[PDB]
Amino acid sequence: GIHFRRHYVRHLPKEVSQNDIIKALASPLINDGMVVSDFADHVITREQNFPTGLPVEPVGVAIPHTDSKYVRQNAISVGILAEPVNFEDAGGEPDPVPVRVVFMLALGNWFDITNVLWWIKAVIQDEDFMQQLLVMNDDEIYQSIYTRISELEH
Amino acid sequence: EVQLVESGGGLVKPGGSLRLSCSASGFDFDNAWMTWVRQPPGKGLEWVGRITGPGEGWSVDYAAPVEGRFTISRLNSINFLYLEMNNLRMEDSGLYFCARTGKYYDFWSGYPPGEEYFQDWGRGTLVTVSSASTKGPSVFPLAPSSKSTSGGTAALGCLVKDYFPEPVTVSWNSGALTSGVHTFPAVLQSSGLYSLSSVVTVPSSSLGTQTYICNVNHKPSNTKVDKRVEPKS
Amino acid sequence: ELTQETGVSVALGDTVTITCEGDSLESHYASWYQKKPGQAPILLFYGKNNRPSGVPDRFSGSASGNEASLTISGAQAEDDAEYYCSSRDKSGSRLSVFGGGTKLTVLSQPKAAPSVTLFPPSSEELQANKATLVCLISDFYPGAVTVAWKADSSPVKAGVETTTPSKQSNNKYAASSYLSLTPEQWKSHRSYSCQVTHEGSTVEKTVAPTECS
């Protein structure tokens, strides 16, 4: 299944770069041995080459990830950004994407990858739930996301 | 360079077993999904089954008509893929391919579990399931006649009947006659045995002077036949 | 579960579309393979818009409803081949499946009528309790013929074996047909006939038990 724990959610401040977000969101996954040590660096490498900016409304979303061979156990870490930060567009668009919600994926199983992308697609199209992600605290977000993830593994 | 090399194909009786091997090099085999595909004689490609990677715990899916009789496995330390086949049936006969399998999923329009595609293939190994026994051909002359002469040239040959298994080689005049020689691919009869024909087109103006001897060699039965084909009277 | 048309013909230099139909294509993309006899398949296209690099740009794939299509813009003589689609057998399935394959004929050569040669049973074979009519079909183009046998004038379906056509060394095609019958049947009728139809033209050879072999 997919490991999603309380310190896999965190709010991030106003002055963080794309690389800071990656490293922060990956820190607890490394610490828990969910991923290899240089996992953040491969996510940055993969992002520089295959961007994951989703310009959905009302809140921009990003799905940074790397290769499944760098994963030891399935996990997801979630980031809420104080200010919007720009990601390059996933559909090859030249315009950057403002993003306030980040789903870092550390999935080694193809069936989880597709189940999780499908779920994220339904989630960012829920205008209500997106607006909650911008006001809930970490314990609320962790409680809400956790029960939803559990609905995928079954 | 990617290389996939299948082995282990052969002849097997209905109800028996066979183990196919596929040696892989030039890519990250340990993390690759790998698929077996077969092509029955004169038929299309048929998906047989697929073994996944480490993240999926090397799980396997199988086509329905093969489920419970076939097992796919791998030995990553030596970069080998295997297909084990039990209770074989005549319809399992055909050419079995090894294929390195990619995964695809489009975020906005895809549906789980996306799609698998076959990005590198081996050349195949042939599986023949048949209760027939080794048997050498009977060889009958195909005499030239006025009916087998267009005008400038004449047609004569050898009928190579009821042998098994493939193949048989046919030469003329011990490999001295190559021009105008046409050995047709074998037909497989409902009996389980093969038949083919070799005909040579020769100068209409030479049938009385030139000898024509077809040399039939069937290695699987250790049989050689030499057969003079002449006009009949 | 994936249906393709048995065969299509295209003129050299034209554009042709090959399609594949199935319920699962409403949810999944198709991949496309070229195969020629005695050679490994080659992936041509997969997904929404993925052409593996090294595949010529004239190949392109598309999707609409329960159909997927491969388009070849400017068919070349190399493209004469069999084309297979592949996808999930059912939406959400972990299994895969191929379509039955489409044979694409690219007309890169003048049409050539088949040479037909029909041999009667040999007396040697008559002395064994068997008898074989041998109809050899050579040098035709394109590479599809149908063969019909006749006892006198009436047709016979029993004991016919026809090979699939095979490419000769000079790019034309060959096939052979065999009519097996008993020596009583052979001496019974006044003649037998092999009828080879090719591009609406039927050429017929005939042999008679009034001997010659």
CA angle B62, B67, B70 (to 5 degrees): 85
C202: containing domain: 109-213
Rounded CA gap, B138 and A66, in Å?
65
Residues of C in contact with B102 (CB under 8 A): 46
* CATH number corresponding to B132-233: 2.60.40.10
Q: Do B44 and C99 touch (CB under 8 A)?
A: yes
Out of B31, B56, B112, whose CB is closest to A118? Answer: B112
Mutate to test the interface with B, among C48, C64, C93, C95 (most CBs of B within 10 A): C95
Helix (H) or strand (E) holding C42: strand C42-46
Show Cβ contacts of residue C156 under 8 Å, excluding neighbours closer than 6 positions. C149, C150, C179
Q: Do B47 and C125 touch (CB under 8 A)?
A: no
In the beta sheet, which residues pair with residue B199? B157, B182
Q: Are residues C2 and C104 in the same domain?
A: yes
From C55, C80, C108, give the residue that closes a domain. C108
From C63, C82, C108, give the residue that closes a domain. C108
* Cβ neighbours of B78 (radius 10 Å): 9
Which three-class secondary structure state does DSSP give residue C181? strand
How many domains does chain C fold into?
2
Rounded CA gap, A70 and C139, in Å?
59
Q: Are residues C144 and C115 in the same domain?
A: yes
CA angle B226, B229, B232 (to 5 degrees): 145
Helix (H) or strand (E) holding B47: strand B46-51
Q: Please spell the DSSP secondary structure of C74-114, one letter per residue.
A: S--GGG-EEEEEEEESSTT-S-EEE---EEEEEE-S--BPP
- Give B 62-91 residues with CB within 8 A of chain A: none
* Residue in C closest to B42 by C-alpha: C164
Q: Are residues C94 and C32 in the same domain?
A: yes
The answer to whether B114 contacts chain C (CB < 8 Å) is yes
Residues of A in contact with B101 (CB under 8 A): none
Q: Do C132 and B104 touch (CB under 8 A)?
A: no
> Is the separation of the CB atoms in C5 and B44 below 8 Å?
no
CA angle C121, C126, C127 (to 5 degrees): 150
* Residue in A closest to B111 by C-alpha: A118
Residue position matching structure tokens 């019909």: C148
CA angle B133, B136, B139 (to 5 degrees): 145
Which three-class secondary structure state does DSSP give residue A147? helix
The answer to whether A154 contacts chain B (CB < 8 Å) is no
Rounded CA gap, B18 and B31, in Å?
26
Distance of residue B33 Cα from the nearest chain C Cα, in angstroms: 13
From C93, C108, C123, give the residue that closes a domain. C108
The answer to whether B232 contacts chain C (CB < 8 Å) is yes
> Is the separation of the CB atoms in A112 and A77 below 8 Å?
no
Every domain of chain B and the residues it spans: 1-131, 132-233
Show Cβ contacts of residue B92 under 8 Å, excluding neighbours closer than 6 positions. B38, B66, B85, B127, B129
Quick check: bond before B141 cis, omega within 30?
Answer: no
Rounded CA gap, B170 and B156, in Å?
14
Q: Are residues C133 and C188 in the same domain?
A: yes
Tokens found for residue B59: 């799980």
Q: Are residues C92 and C153 in the same domain?
A: no
What is the experimental resolution, given in Å to one decimal place? 2.2
- Give A 75-104 residues with CB within 8 A of chain B: 90
A107: containing domain: 1-154
Q: Are residues C93 and C121 in the same domain?
A: no
Q: State the amino acid at position B114 in one-letter form.
A: G
Q: Are residues C125 and C95 in the same domain?
A: no
Give partners of C (≥3 CB pairs < 8 A).
Answer: B
Show Cβ contacts of residue A66 under 8 Å, excluding neighbours closer than 6 positions. A39, A42, A43, A45, A46
Q: Please spell the DSSP secondary structure of A28-92, one letter per residue.
A: HHHHTTSB-TTHHHHHHHHHHHS--EE--SSS-EE-----GGGBSS-EEEEEEEEEEEEE-BTTS
Q: Are residues C92 and C113 in the same domain?
A: no
Distance of residue B108 Cα from the nearest chain A Cα, in angstroms: 7
How many domains does chain A fold into?
1
Distance of residue B195 Cα from the nearest chain C Cα, in angstroms: 9
Rounded CA gap, A144 and A88, in Å?
28
Which three-class secondary structure state does DSSP give residue A134? coil
Residues of B in contact with A117 (CB under 8 A): 105, 107, 110
Q: Are residues C9 and C92 in the same domain?
A: yes
Q: Are residues C1 and C97 in the same domain?
A: yes
Q: Do C213 and B159 touch (CB under 8 A)?
A: no
PDB experimental method: X-ray
- Give the domain CATH number at C38: 2.60.40.10
* Cβ neighbours of A17 (radius 10 Å): 10
Distance of residue B16 Cα from the nearest chain C Cα, in angstroms: 26
Rounded CA gap, B214 and B225, in Å?
8
Which candidate, C132, C139, C70, C127, places its Cα nearest to that of C101? C70
Tokens found for residue A96: 């950057």
Q: Are residues C152 and C198 in the same domain?
A: yes
Q: Are residues C181 and C100 in the same domain?
A: no
Could you tell me how many residues make up chain A? 154
Which candidate, C161, C148, C119, C133, places its Cα nearest to that of B192? C161
Mutate to test the interface with B, among A109, A120, A153 (most CBs of B within 10 A): A109
- Give the domain CATH number at A22: 3.40.930.10
Quick check: bond before C41 cis, omega within 30?
Answer: no
Residues of C in contact with B109 (CB under 8 A): 48
Q: Do B113 and A110 touch (CB under 8 A)?
A: yes
Residues of A in contact with B50 (CB under 8 A): none
Show Cβ contacts of residue C169 under 8 Å, excluding neighbours closer than 6 positions. none
In the beta sheet, which residues pair with residue B35? B50, B99
Mutate to test the interface with B, among A65, A70, A71, A110 (most CBs of B within 10 A): A110
> Is the separation of the CB atoms in B154 and B212 below 8 Å?
no
CATH 3.40.50.720 fits B1-131, yes or no: no
